[PDB]
């Protein structure tokens, strides 16, 4: 289906370029778990349409700014392994100036469950950690005000299972100590350790009477509470599997809420989030600690710069539009613009000087726009100036013995003279001598820019 | 479809027949299309193929393969249509020689049509004939 996927995109594109950036951003999560696979190309499509939405909330929108962040490095990281590379490269360009505008088929992963054991020191506290969450569920059926009875009848408020703590015997425990044994080797498997820390802690019904200590007041921090969305995350993704494991059990399909985790409702990662958490606020009831056993452009500037080193180094052998996508990021940092921007200079120009002497043609051309982006830069924001203007002087003479490639050192060298004299001449005299050798024999290009940009 | 297109696309298609019917076998149109020279996507292929029981037969592979052919010549000749008029070569043609080059014959209406190039043609005037195309070729 050609136009028929067209079609959709255009649907889909339409649909979010007419939509407030809070869906927007509650789509960019799914986005943002697309980015990953980009190198398809309309995974790369939902990508445009994601830069789409960049660039209009660039804005006054430019909770999922740190996810912006993280898609743009993980886009960043994945752009980076090799046409449909130059629509994402230039794409990326405006969304890079909207992250520096900040800067201003499922297949679900559950892990093996009864491979390692537990300590004992944890199982002197599952004998009062399985009675509580027992004591909380009677409490919330306490809330209805259920009373034991002998026939299990729904209607007639009868439940059979209420019964006191003396008599429950261990396969009467078990039941409900399966998912508790089961969820703490999952949180215990991975690394992860809970040592000792200090000491800790309407009308009623008949049957079992739990005066439990309150559920509804107890909230953790915001690693504990990620490491308990990680821990909700595995429960959802054990009971996907459960259901996938009935659904073709009969000999059918598949049901339509096998979706990615980030496009379901509240309750159903509230659920699994209250499973996982009813070890860990009872932990803060008993104060036990749950331990694990923007700037992001910023930073990822020096990396970037890295990376463009590497690919000065290493960019004129097809990767010519890797260096103009590199470019482009740093033209769109120029325009969303600090002794690491200091850093990013000293490597940008290592990046004009690792291939100075084989100044393949259309990174050429790029570069000096790339160039005047650079001077942008310095005219948007300690003595290497005097070995860098040596290094101008080699590359204007790796550039000068050839088209109009001499013109275009001048016109580089101009832009250098433009971005440092807006705010030492023995480079000065290598240019007069250099005027001098290649000036009566393109040339008056030269002139005009050796004529003012002398300051 | 010409004289010499309508006899190669019947002498594919009934040289790529056997049984006398005028139908071929469902799986023959990439194979009829690459003896054409023809190599399109695949999706492109599953569309022609369900625009065609599964015996894909003589009428509208004689239309759909019109179809394609009559794209290449509305780039061909709308290139050079144009390449009549417009001597130094770069597709900028005056307002006012848009004017003599509009009220052909054939056609040749009143002042609605060409009223209806100038209103809305871009004009600074050279006029590029893309506009023209994404104007009236809807």
Same mark, same amino acid.
């Given at each position: 289906?050609?136009?028929?996927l067209t079609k959709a995109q255009r649907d889909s594109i339409e649909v979010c370029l007419l939509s407030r950036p809070s869906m927007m951003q509650h789509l960019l999560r799914r986005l943002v778990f697309d980015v990953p696979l980009l190198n398809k190309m309309p995974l790369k499509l939902l990508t445009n349409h994601y830069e789409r939405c960049w660039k209009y909330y660039c804005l006054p929108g430019g909770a999922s700014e740190e996810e912006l962040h993280l898609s743009?490095?993980?886009?960043?990281?994945?752009?980076?392994?090799?046409?449909?590379?130059?629509?994402?490269?230039?794409?990326?360009?405006?969304?890079?100036?909207?992250?520096?505008?900040?800067?201003?088929?499922?297949?679900?992963?559950?892990?093996?469950?009864?491979?390692?054991?537990?300590?004992?020191?944890?199982?002197?506290?599952?004998?009062?950690?399985?009675?509580?969450?027992?004591?909380?569920?009677?409490?919330?059926?306490?809330?209805?005000?259920?009373? %034991?009875?002998?026939?299990?009848?729904?209607?007639?408020?009868?439940?059979?299972?209420?019964?006191?703590?003396?008599?429950?015997?261990?396969?009467?425990?078990?039941?409900?100590?399966?998912?508790?044994?089961?969820?703490?080797?999952?949180?215990?498997?991975?690394?992860?350790?809970?040592?000792?820390?200090?000491?800790?802690?309407?009308?009623?019904?008949?049957?079992?009477?739990?005066?439990?200590?309150?559920?509804?007041?107890?909230?953790?921090?915001?690693?504990?509470?990620?490491?308990?969305?990680?821990?909700?995350?595995?429960?959802?993704?054990?009971?996907?599997?459960?259901?996938?494991?009935?659904?073709?059990?009969?000999?059918?399909?598949?049901?339509?809420?096998?979706?990615?985790?980030?496009?379901?409702?509240?309750?159903?990662?509230?659920?699994?989030?209250?499973?996982?958490?009813?070890?860990?606020?009872?932990?803060?009831?008993?104060? %036990?600690?749950?331990?694990?056993?923007?700037?992001?452009?910023?930073?990822?500037?020096?990396?970037?710069?890295?990376?463009?080193?590497?690919?000065?180094?290493?960019?004129?052998?097809?990767?010519?539009?890797?260096?103009?996508?590199?470019?482009?990021?740093?033209?769109?940092?120029?325009?969303?613009?600090?002794?690491?921007?200091?850093?990013?200079?000293?490597?940008?120009?290592?990046?004009?000087?690792?291939?100075?002497?084989?100044?393949?043609?259309?990174?050429?051309?790029?570069?000096?726009?790339?160039?005047?982006?650079?001077?942008?830069?310095?005219?948007?924001?300690?003595?290497?100036?005097?070995?860098?203007?040596?290094?101008?002087?080699?590359?204007?003479?790796?550039?000068?013995?050839?088209?109009?490639?001499?013109?275009?050192?001048?016109?580089?060298?101009?832009?250098?003279?433009?971005?440092?004299?807006?705010?030492?001449?023995?480079?000065?005299?290598?240019?007069?001598?250099?005027?001098?050798?290649?000036?009566?024999?393109?040339?008056?290009?030269?002139?005009?820019?050796?004529?003012?940009?002398?300051? | 479809?010409?004289?010499?297109?309508?006899?190669?696309?019947?002498?594919?298609?009934?040289?790529?027949?056997?049984?006398?019917?005028?139908?071929?076998?469902?799986?023959?149109?990439?194979?009829?299309?690459?003896?054409?020279?023809?190599?399109?996507?695949?999706?492109?292929?599953?569309?022609?193929?369900?625009?065609?029981?599964?015996?894909?037969?003589?009428?509208?592979?004689?239309?759909?393969?019109?179809?394609?052919?009559?794209?290449?010549? @509305?780039?061909?000749?709308?290139?050079?249509?144009?390449?009549?008029?417009?001597?130094?070569?770069?597709?900028?043609? @005056?307002?006012?020689?848009?004017?003599?080059?509009?009220?052909?014959?054939?056609?040749?209406?009143?002042?609605?049509?060409?009223?209806?190039?100038?209103?809305?043609?871009?004009?600074?005037?050279?006029?590029?004939?893309?506009?023209?195309?994404?104007?009236?070729?809807?």
């Open positions: 289906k050609g136009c028929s743009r490095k993980l886009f960043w990281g994945i752009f980076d392994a090799l046409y449909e590379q130059e629509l994402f490269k230039l794409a990326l360009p405006c969304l890079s100036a909207v992250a520096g505008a900040l800067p201003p088929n499922f297949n679900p992963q559950p892990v093996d469950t009864s491979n390692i054991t537990i300590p004992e020191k944890l199982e002197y506290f599952i004998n009062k950690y399985a009675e509580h969450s027992h004591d909380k569920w009677s409490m919330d059926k306490l809330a209805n005000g259920w009373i %034991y009875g002998e026939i299990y009848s729904d209607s007639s408020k009868v439940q059979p299972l209420m019964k006191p703590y003396k008599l429950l015997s261990e396969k009467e425990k078990e039941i409900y100590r399966w998912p508790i044994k089961e969820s703490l080797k999952t949180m215990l498997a991975w690394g992860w350790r809970i040592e000792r820390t200090r000491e800790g802690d309407v009308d009623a019904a008949h049957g079992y009477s739990p005066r439990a200590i309150d559920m509804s007041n107890v909230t953790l921090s915001r690693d504990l509470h990620a490491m308990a969305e990680m821990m909700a995350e595995n429960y959802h993704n054990i009971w996907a599997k459960k259901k996938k494991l009935e659904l073709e059990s009969k000999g059918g399909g598949n049901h339509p809420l096998l979706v990615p985790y980030d496009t379901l409702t509240a309750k159903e990662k509230a659920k699994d989030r209250e499973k996982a958490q009813d070890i860990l606020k009872f932990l803060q009831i008993n104060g %036990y600690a749950v331990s694990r056993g923007y700037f992001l452009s910023a930073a990822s500037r020096p990396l970037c710069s890295g990376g463009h080193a590497s690919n000065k180094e290493k960019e004129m052998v097809f990767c010519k539009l890797g260096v103009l996508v590199r470019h482009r990021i740093s033209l769109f940092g120029n325009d969303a613009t600090l002794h690491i921007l200091g850093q990013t200079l000293d490597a940008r120009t290592v990046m004009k000087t690792g291939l100075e002497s084989v100044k393949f043609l259309d990174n050429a051309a790029e570069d000096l726009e790339k160039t005047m982006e650079n001077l942008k830069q310095g005219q948007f924001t300690t003595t290497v100036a005097l070995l860098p203007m040596l290094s101008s002087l080699f590359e204007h003479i790796g550039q000068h013995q050839f088209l109009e490639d001499v013109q275009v050192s001048c016109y580089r060298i101009l832009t250098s003279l433009y971005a440092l004299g807006t705010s030492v001449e023995r480079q000065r005299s290598a240019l007069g001598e250099c005027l001098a050798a290649f000036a009566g024999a393109a040339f008056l290009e030269t002139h005009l820019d050796k004529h003012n940009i002398y300051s | 479809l010409t004289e010499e297109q309508i006899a190669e696309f019947k002498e594919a298609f009934s040289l790529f027949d056997k049984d006398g019917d005028g139908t071929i076998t469902t799986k023959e149109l990439g194979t009829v299309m690459r003896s054409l020279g023809q190599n399109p996507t695949e999706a492109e292929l599953q569309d022609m193929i369900n625009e065609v029981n599964g015996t894909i037969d003589f009428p509208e592979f004689l239309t759909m393969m019109a179809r394609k052919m009559k794209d290449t010549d @509305s780039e061909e000749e709308i290139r050079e249509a144009f390449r009549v008029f417009d001597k130094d070569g770069n597709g900028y043609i @005056s307002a006012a020689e848009l004017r003599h080059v509009m009220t052909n014959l054939g056609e040749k209406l009143t002042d609605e049509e060409v009223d209806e190039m100038i209103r809305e043609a871009d004009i600074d005037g050279q006029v590029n004939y893309e506009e023209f195309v994404q104007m009236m070729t809807a």
